[PDB]
Amino acid sequence: RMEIVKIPVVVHVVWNEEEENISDAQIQSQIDILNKDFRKLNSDVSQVPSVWSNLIADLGIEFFLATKDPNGNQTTGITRTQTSVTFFTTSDEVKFASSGGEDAWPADRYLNIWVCHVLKSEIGQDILGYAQFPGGPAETDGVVIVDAAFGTTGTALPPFDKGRTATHEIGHWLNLYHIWGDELRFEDPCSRSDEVDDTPNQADPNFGAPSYPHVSCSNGPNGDMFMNYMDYVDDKCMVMFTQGQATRVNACLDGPRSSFLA
Amino acid sequence: RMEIVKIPVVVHVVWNEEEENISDAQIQSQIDILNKDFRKLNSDVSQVPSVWSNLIADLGIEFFLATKDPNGNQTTGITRTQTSVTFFTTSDEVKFASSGGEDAWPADRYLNIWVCHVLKSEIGQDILGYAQFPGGPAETDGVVIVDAAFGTTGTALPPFDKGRTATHEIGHWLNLYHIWGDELRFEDPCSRSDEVDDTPNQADPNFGAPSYPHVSCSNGPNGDMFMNYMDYVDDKCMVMFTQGQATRVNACLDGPRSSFLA
Ligand SMILES: [Ca+2]
Ligand SMILES: [Ca+2]
Ligand SMILES: [Ca+2]
Ligand SMILES: [Ca+2]
Ligand SMILES: [Ca+2]
Ligand SMILES: [Zn+2]
Ligand SMILES: [Zn+2]
């Protein structure tokens, strides 16, 4: 029998122009997707090659917008903060009131999700989202997603309009690593591990919509598990976590995030 | 005539075992190095190939341990905080008391330098230090260096015992990018720029002690400027900033860090 872990979420919408102050419906659409993907209830799980059907996991996690604020008072579970800031970066400006964002709620009790319009990496690349892995400071714990990649209605835009950026970043929040192993430019692309046996060793990230099989690192004939949420493919293409990943998630819930357990 | 910008520094020593509570002498040795490297007074500047002699810059910045704390009271400019934490990461745990580190002093008035024993990247690689570029939140502004790579005496160890890790990270703090451009694994290694014309286009980081010339990206015959502080070579090998880098630094001081100006 699975113990379903129910995670309270607070969504911090940080907006400059009115259009970025995204609707309640758009936010709720994201929660709905999380409750499918983390329970193996997404219909598109049918896309997984049958050779790997046996490895598809139900992570046994569900999410809901918080009903009580950190001090025990009724809340919608959504904060909305106007800002004059035109873009945020991975340096966490969105996570502090002082830098034109919104302060985190207590990370031992809530999953903080910030949503903003523009997000850049430290070297100016536009990105869709970023996570903090377990064990970092509470002040910046959580995930950040751009509004055009959040939810399945409103400002969400293809190919990132199926809510999978949040599924991917929350995977990091639960201690999952990129399936290809995150090699640096000069390292052998077959050399690093995501620390999960049942995800095939893989060269580089996959983007777009690859055709099965996509072989790398001598992993034929089945190839890369590019339909795993921890690859970089388009939303419609990523549809599963593995049981080996569930093991890591379980270790995260039993350890550093055990405060979320009943 | 150069206007010398004088930057007050606070060093936050965060220590678990006694040996990590580094000496006043070791800390002062680091300040002494910064005051040579940022003024072109380091004797090893003679190591620069003569073809590039004309490009070597005096940044006109000097550093001193703060004499007044954030509320105007006398200070040594050094905080020392015992911790039970055994390693810190790029997630900034060392920058908050809550996560076993030490809170930043106001970033508009001080350069925060944290020193700890062990530092890892997000994927568990041992690293020597890391910076926050300008514009990020004040709470985490500054640089972090491991004690074995800090100063020129005490616990500092070759090949990182000439105080250059701090010179390099403070370069980032002043808006300088890696000279090779930070390509991702799958990108053309000649494709990204550090946004400085007088640093030659360069494939990858250099490590150790390269022999001149080291050509990449068709940048012959002179090759990579691997003796620049913003490469990744050993301390004894990095000895200069360029005038083009000085331009970026000046723009940083005139803009986002203008609060440090007299
Ligand atoms: Ca941070
Ligand atoms: Ca694997
Ligand atoms: Ca790989
Ligand atoms: Ca250049
Ligand atoms: Ca390059
Ligand atoms: Zn990711
Ligand atoms: Zn660097």
What is the spatial distance between Cα A145 and Cα A22, in angstroms, rounded to a whole number? 12
C-beta atoms of A91 and B137 within 8 A: yes
What is the spatial distance between Cα A136 and Cα A113, in angstroms, rounded to a whole number? 16
DSSP A252: H
A194 annotated as belonging to a binding site for a ligand: yes
> Least CA distance to B102: which residue of chain A?
A137
Query: Is there a cis peptide before residue B70, judged by omega within 30 degrees of 0?
Result: no
**A85 near B137, Cβ under 8 Å?**
no
What is the spatial distance between Cα B103 and Cα B158, in angstroms, rounded to a whole number? 30
Instruction: Please list every residue in chain A whose beta carbon sits closer than 8 Å to the beta carbon of residue B140.
Output: 91-92, 140
Residue A169 designated active-site: yes
Question: Residue A202: what residue type?
Answer: Q
Q: Which residues of B are identified as catalytic?
A: 169
Secondary structure (3-state) at A113: strand
* Joined tokens for residue B25: 């002498």
**How many angstroms is the resolution?**
1.7
**B108 near B20, Cβ under 8 Å?**
no
CATH class of residue range A1-262: alpha beta
C-beta atoms of A140 and B91 within 8 A: yes
Beta strand ranges found along chain A (DSSP E):
5-15, 61-65, 78-82, 88-89, 111-116, 119-120, 129-131, 143-146
Method: X-ray
What is the spatial distance between Cα B23 and Cα B28, in angstroms, rounded to a whole number? 9
**B82 near B74, Cβ under 8 Å?**
no
Minimal C-alpha gap between A108 and chain B (Å): 13
DSSP result, chain B: ----EEEEEEEEEEESSGGGS--HHHHHHHHHHHHHHTTT--GGGGGS-GGGGGGB----EEEEE-SB-TTS-B--SEEEEE-S---EETT-GGG-GGGTS-PPPPTTT-EEEEEES-EE-TTS-B-SEEE--TTS-GGG-SEEEEGGGSSSSTT--TTS-SSHHHHHHHHHHTTPPPTT----TTS-TTS---S-TTSPP-SS---S-PPSP---TT-TTT---TTBTTS---TTT--B-BHHHHHHHHHHHHTTTGGG--
Q: Number of Cβ pairs closer than 8 Å across A and B?
A: 76
Q: Mark the breaks in chain B: residue after which each occurs, C to N over 2.5 Å.
A: none
Q: What is the 3-state secondary structure (H, E, C) of B82-96?
A: ECCCCCEECCCHHHC
Instruction: Please list every residue in chain B whose beta carbon sits closer than 8 Å to the beta carbon of residue A184.
Output: 185
**A169 near A175, Cβ under 8 Å?**
no
Sole residue written with tokens 């980081």 = B205
C-beta atoms of A185 and B204 within 8 A: yes
DSSP result, A121-147: -TTS-B-SEEE--TTS-GGG-SEEEEG
What is the spatial distance between Cα A163 and Cα A44, in angstroms, rounded to a whole number? 13
> Least CA distance to B195: which residue of chain A?
A123
DSSP A107: T
Instruction: Enumerate residues 6+ apart whose C-beta is below 8 A from B124.
Output: none
C-beta atoms of A92 and B137 within 8 A: yes
* Selection from B169, B39, B43 nearest residue B115 by Cα: B169
C-beta atoms of B189 and A189 within 8 A: no
What is the spatial distance between Cα A175 and Cα A167, in angstroms, rounded to a whole number? 13
Selected for mutation to probe chain B from A91, A103, A195, A196 (highest B CB count within 10 Å) is A91
For the CA atoms of A121, A124, A128, A129, what is the dihedral angle to 10 degrees?
A: 20
What is the spatial distance between Cα B30 and Cα B45, in angstroms, rounded to a whole number? 18
What is the spatial distance between Cα B93 and Cα B253, in angstroms, rounded to a whole number? 28
Say how many residues make up chain B: 262
The rounded Å distance from CA A132 to ligand 2 centre is: 21
φ/ψ of residue A146, rounded to 5: -75, 150
